[PDB]
Design a protein around this ligand. Structure first.
Ligand SMILES: [K+]
Ligand SMILES: [K+]
Ligand SMILES: [K+]
Ligand SMILES: [K+]
Ligand SMILES: [K+]
Ligand SMILES: [K+]
Ligand SMILES: [K+]
Ligand SMILES: [K+]
Ligand SMILES: [K+]
Ligand SMILES: [K+]
Ligand SMILES: [K+]
Ligand SMILES: [K+]
Ligand SMILES: [K+]
Ligand SMILES: [Mg+2]
Ligand SMILES: [Mg+2]
Ligand SMILES: [Mg+2]
Ligand SMILES: [Mg+2]
Ligand SMILES: [Mg+2]
Ligand SMILES: [Mg+2]
Ligand SMILES: [Mg+2]
Ligand SMILES: [Mg+2]
Ligand SMILES: [Mg+2]
Ligand SMILES: [Mg+2]
Ligand SMILES: [Mg+2]
Ligand SMILES: [Mg+2]
Ligand SMILES: [Mg+2]
Ligand SMILES: [Mg+2]
Ligand SMILES: [Mg+2]
Ligand SMILES: [Mg+2]
Ligand SMILES: [Mg+2]
Ligand SMILES: [Mg+2]
Ligand SMILES: [Mg+2]
Ligand SMILES: [Mg+2]
Ligand SMILES: [Mg+2]
Ligand SMILES: [Mg+2]
Ligand SMILES: [Mg+2]
Ligand SMILES: [Mg+2]
Ligand SMILES: [Mg+2]
Ligand SMILES: [Mg+2]
Ligand SMILES: [Mg+2]
Ligand SMILES: [Mg+2]
Ligand SMILES: [Mg+2]
Ligand SMILES: [Mg+2]
Ligand SMILES: [Mg+2]
Ligand SMILES: [Mg+2]
Ligand SMILES: [Mg+2]
Ligand SMILES: [Mg+2]
Ligand SMILES: [Mg+2]
Ligand SMILES: [Mg+2]
Ligand SMILES: [Mg+2]
Ligand SMILES: [Mg+2]
Ligand SMILES: [Mg+2]
Ligand SMILES: [Mg+2]
Ligand SMILES: [Mg+2]
Ligand SMILES: [Mg+2]
Ligand SMILES: [Mg+2]
Ligand SMILES: [Mg+2]
Ligand SMILES: [Mg+2]
Ligand SMILES: [Mg+2]
Ligand SMILES: [Mg+2]
Ligand SMILES: [Mg+2]
Ligand SMILES: [Mg+2]
Ligand SMILES: [Mg+2]
Ligand SMILES: [Mg+2]
Ligand SMILES: [Mg+2]
Ligand SMILES: [Mg+2]
Ligand SMILES: [Mg+2]
Ligand SMILES: [Mg+2]
Ligand SMILES: [Mg+2]
Ligand SMILES: [Mg+2]
Ligand SMILES: [Mg+2]
Ligand SMILES: [Mg+2]
Ligand SMILES: [Mg+2]
Ligand SMILES: [Mg+2]
Ligand SMILES: [Mg+2]
Ligand SMILES: [Mg+2]
Ligand SMILES: [Mg+2]
Ligand SMILES: [Mg+2]
Ligand SMILES: [Mg+2]
Ligand SMILES: [Mg+2]
Ligand SMILES: [Mg+2]
Lengths: 122, 50, 21, 94, 38, 94
RNA sequence: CUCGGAGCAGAACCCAACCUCCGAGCAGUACAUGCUAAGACUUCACCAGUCAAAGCGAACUACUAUACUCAAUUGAUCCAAUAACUUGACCAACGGAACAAGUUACCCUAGGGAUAACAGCGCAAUCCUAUUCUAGAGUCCAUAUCAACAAUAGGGUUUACGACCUCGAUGUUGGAUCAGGACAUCCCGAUGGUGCAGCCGCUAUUAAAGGUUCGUUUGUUCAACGAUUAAAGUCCUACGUGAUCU
RNA sequence: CCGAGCCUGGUGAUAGCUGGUUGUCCAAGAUAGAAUCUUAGUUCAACUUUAAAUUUGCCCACAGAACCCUCUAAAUCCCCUUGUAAAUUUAACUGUUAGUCCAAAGAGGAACAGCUCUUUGGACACUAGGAAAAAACCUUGUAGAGAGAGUAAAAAAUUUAACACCCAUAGUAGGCCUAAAAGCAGCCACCAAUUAAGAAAGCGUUCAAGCUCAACACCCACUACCUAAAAAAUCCCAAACAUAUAA
RNA sequence: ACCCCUAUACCUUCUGCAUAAUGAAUUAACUAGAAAUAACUUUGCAAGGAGAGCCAAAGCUAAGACCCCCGAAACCAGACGA
């Protein structure tokens, strides 16, 4: 019978080789996720369809930010085959009230607080 | 056979993908495939599978 | 329960000689 | 075509995504007066702002939650010290 | 349909069939063939 | 002369299907994406103990809005002007 | 054909087959198995069924004593019997119609390819063929020839199975007529082997251009028989072909 | 036009059965079972729809849920947090209750079926792309216009059987058994001559002869020690290509 | 205009129909959803409502809004027919 899958915890234990490959820092884990759905929920069990709705991933290729906490990660582990998970990067820190309207999320996962639409002078 | 599994240069193995439910592959696999690891299909045994 | 670590705590027939005429 | 190359340069895979080719105004008045913002760009500006505010809201909740947990741990440590004090022992030890 | 165990080799699902092809054994390939070295 | 008994893709005897070169590459490409997802789920920012209760206030207030909207259902107000304006259908020039 | 236990259904519940097994239509002991009443369970509805603290009244200061032991151990309404209490069906087709069997090819109507006979299709148990294996037979000799126990493939001609198309119709044997095709070749051609002297044969490779009889009996396909022939081949074609015929 | 006439009337007989059922637009919408002279139907549940009330619903952390027993199964139940926005109750009803394939755990058959029966999930009975055509596999869903753009799934690979050369005397026809057994029908031993050769590994002879192998010598045979085919009936079946920087 | 590219009529019935399942030559005309019980919605009046009856522990009165067509073989009565 096809039932829900229990993923062993050994799968989610990063080796030192993995850290070098992906550049993550285990001592400074990223605060937020960037979850994007890249696979259809059709031809998948209903519990995967429901979790996608809970995460706000109804529309594919639409980035969504979620907190890097065990409860949120538990939902991600169920539909990890339908999504792309990337860490959110803040080169200039969190957006402030002054630059709320000048933010953009680049394809590299970086949220830039200034977006001038001009070439760099350097 | 143990040597073949040790020096296997393929980054992807049946055991790793099936146990981790990668790609949702367990929707087309069997619960016995968690322990057979792709070496057995029905009554048939495939010695070349690693 | 089976999955719990306390599985089989109530087993007693393995301590008794099998009397099956 | 060339979606992967654009990703390697930090650009959007689809050229219609973020960038000067899309977000810049398509036209302006001949005398130089700027045109009103395009309705598509207004939708993206509002959608980006909500995403930016959600990032701040999630970050502040985790920061506040971490402080609350740390505050509880500090409070728990102090409670153990107070219970140690009691009446002076007597009897055999005196 | 057919049961889990069949006398003939049952046709695998295409998703499973692609998994078998991807996870084939790849023997290590030396940079220089051993017969070409002393 | 070569025909598949019954339907092609169902039954005991099926038309064989073979994995092309690009079929393998597509599966490997998606396998690499999921492998990176495993890495980013291995480093939670907070533990389960620290996470507890950090968003209870917002969640409770969010549901109170749902309750408020659910219990606010009522017929709309009715105005005299709306009823009287129907007399304008026979308005004529003098 | 109703009810209960176990497997299928391995761990909360549930879960079918004209599925695999074992049983029930009682018995025994009490005579407070008296009355009443929170909160619950429930056989996937309902009906029905199940457990119950407290309290009243008893028992009791020995009695695993307080809703008997026991798994199922059973039947609604109406109605009938009775002063009352209460009782009454193998209504077993067991949610039960108060009481009604055969036959129809003399048949009719409404439908159904939701469902059989016909053909197609699926399948290959059965049937057929090849190869692998080398016990045995062939005086000796496994492989001239034949072949056991088994193994791996293939064919879709037999008998079955399934019920997918057709019941606001897809007309059945055999024959006549015309034949199309397959080769797993009966004859004719070309070859290998032989337990091939020759003459006749056996076996295998290759070959589908050509040919493959007339009659007695039988509705016959067959089969038996007569006389021949270089030979009187095996099958498919909606068991080829009835808007061509019988 | 008689298994019992015909006409009229009851009669608009009845039909769980078949057929048909008329303007535009949008929205929600595929559903465990139980009983039934019942399985071609109905009623109650379930599911679905509308309106309404007010409050948790779903996803789930530990802790927790059986002994008997062969599979020490995949899992489930419970469940705060969290991510989410639904859920229950009240009022009023209809329809669905003749199911198909795929994956998985099983049962029946033949470890047959496009077979049959359950369970978990998917898809179909809705869109579009792909696997050639294609309900059931893959990709993908929320709707319009565009002579823009990035992508998803998405093309079938493979071609196999050479092999050594050279050389051989002898105790002795070992004993026993046996008509005969002489290396080679059985039994026992399996010692020894020659630098070198088993009281004989495979053939052969009625028994013996006879032909090989294991010996010496010569000498770099300086070997792979992983395997195997084909046949159907109208007419093969896209055309083709081994070479220009992986997109 | 055609040539190019794309496209398996419709209704019904079904698990599923281009289906070689059903009906249809075509035109015009004719030919098929009738209502209580409550409930809902909108007025009136209000512990009363209603133009005797009836209902009423916010009810009551009034209105709006839901329920098809064709077809048997038969049965019976009374006539008419050798
Ligand atoms: K088939
Ligand atoms: K009955
Ligand atoms: K069969
Ligand atoms: K028929
Ligand atoms: K011929
Ligand atoms: K005759
Ligand atoms: K019926
Ligand atoms: K001898
Ligand atoms: K029709
Ligand atoms: K019909
Ligand atoms: K057809
Ligand atoms: K049809
Ligand atoms: K027909
Ligand atoms: Mg199965
Ligand atoms: Mg076909
Ligand atoms: Mg059980
Ligand atoms: Mg259940
Ligand atoms: Mg119940
Ligand atoms: Mg009591
Ligand atoms: Mg009954
Ligand atoms: Mg019952
Ligand atoms: Mg009755
Ligand atoms: Mg007769
Ligand atoms: Mg009659
Ligand atoms: Mg009839
Ligand atoms: Mg049928
Ligand atoms: Mg049926
Ligand atoms: Mg017929
Ligand atoms: Mg048939
Ligand atoms: Mg036919
Ligand atoms: Mg076959
Ligand atoms: Mg012999
Ligand atoms: Mg011989
Ligand atoms: Mg066989
Ligand atoms: Mg046939
Ligand atoms: Mg069937
Ligand atoms: Mg017809
Ligand atoms: Mg004929
Ligand atoms: Mg012919
Ligand atoms: Mg031939
Ligand atoms: Mg041939
Ligand atoms: Mg000739
Ligand atoms: Mg010769
Ligand atoms: Mg015929
Ligand atoms: Mg004809
Ligand atoms: Mg005929
Ligand atoms: Mg007459
Ligand atoms: Mg009628
Ligand atoms: Mg009837
Ligand atoms: Mg809709
Ligand atoms: Mg009855
Ligand atoms: Mg029914
Ligand atoms: Mg639940
Ligand atoms: Mg909860
Ligand atoms: Mg109803
Ligand atoms: Mg079926
Ligand atoms: Mg289903
Ligand atoms: Mg239907
Ligand atoms: Mg297509
Ligand atoms: Mg869209
Ligand atoms: Mg000697
Ligand atoms: Mg001797
Ligand atoms: Mg001899
Ligand atoms: Mg010897
Ligand atoms: Mg000799
Ligand atoms: Mg030699
Ligand atoms: Mg061609
Ligand atoms: Mg083409
Ligand atoms: Mg076309
Ligand atoms: Mg049908
Ligand atoms: Mg079609
Ligand atoms: Mg036609
Ligand atoms: Mg038609
Ligand atoms: Mg019909
Ligand atoms: Mg007409
Ligand atoms: Mg009406
Ligand atoms: Mg009405
Ligand atoms: Mg009619
Ligand atoms: Mg009568
Ligand atoms: Mg009469
Ligand atoms: Mg007369």
């Amino acid at each position: 019978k096809f039932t829900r899958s229990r993923i062993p915890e050994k799968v989610f234990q990063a080796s030192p080789e993995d850290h070098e490959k992906y550049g993550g820092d285990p001592q400074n884990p990223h605060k937020l996720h960037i979850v994007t759905r890249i696979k259809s929920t059709r031809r998948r069990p209903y519990w995967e369809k429901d979790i996608i709705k809970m995460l706000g991933l109804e529309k594919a290729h639409t980035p969504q930010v979620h907190k890097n906490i065990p409860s949120v990660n538990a939902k991600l582990k169920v539909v990890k085959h339908l999504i792309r998970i990337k860490p959110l990067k803040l080169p200039q820190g969190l957006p402030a009230e002054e630059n709320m309207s000048n933010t953009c999320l680049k394809s590299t996962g970086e949220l830039v607080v200034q977006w001038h639409l001009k070439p760099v002078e350097q | 056979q143990e040597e073949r599994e040790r020096n296997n240069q393929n980054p992807w193995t049946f055991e790793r993908i099936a146990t981790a439910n990668m790609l949702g592959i367990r929707k087309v696999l069997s619960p016995y495939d968690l322990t057979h690891k792709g070496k057995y299909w029905g009554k048939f045994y495939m010695p070349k599978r690693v | 329960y089976k999955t719990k670590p306390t599985h089989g705590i109530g087993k007693y027939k393995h301590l008794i000689k099998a009397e099956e005429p | 075509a060339g979606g992967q190359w654009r990703l390697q340069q930090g650009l959007a895979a689809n050229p219609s995504g973020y960038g000067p080719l899309t977000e810049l105004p398509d036209w302006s008045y001949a005398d130089g007066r700027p045109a009103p913002p395009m309705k598509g760009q207004l939708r993206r500006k509002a959608e980006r702002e909500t995403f930016a505010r959600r990032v701040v809201l999630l970050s502040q909740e985790m920061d506040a939650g971490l402080q609350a947990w740390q505050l509880r741990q500090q409070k728990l440590q102090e409670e153990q010290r107070k219970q140690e004090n009691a009446l002076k022992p007597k009897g055999a030890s005196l | 349909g057919s049961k889990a165990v069949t006398r003939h080799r049952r046709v695998m699902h295409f998703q499973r069939q692609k998994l078998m092809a991807v996870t084939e054994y790849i023997p290590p390939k030396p940079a220089i063939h051993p017969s070409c070295l002393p | 002369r070569g025909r598949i008994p019954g339907r092609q893709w169902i039954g005991k005897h099926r038309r064989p299907r073979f994995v092309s070169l690009r079929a393998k590459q597509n599966m490997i490409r998606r396998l690499e994406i999921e492998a990176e997802n495993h890495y980013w789920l291995s480093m939670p920012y907070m533990t389960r103990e620290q996470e507890r209760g950090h968003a209870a206030v917002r969640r409770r207030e969010a549901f109170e809005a749902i309750k408020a909207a659910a219990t606010s259902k009522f017929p709309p107000h009715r105005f005299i002007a709306d009823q009287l304006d129907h007399l304008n259908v026979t308005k004529k020039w003098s």
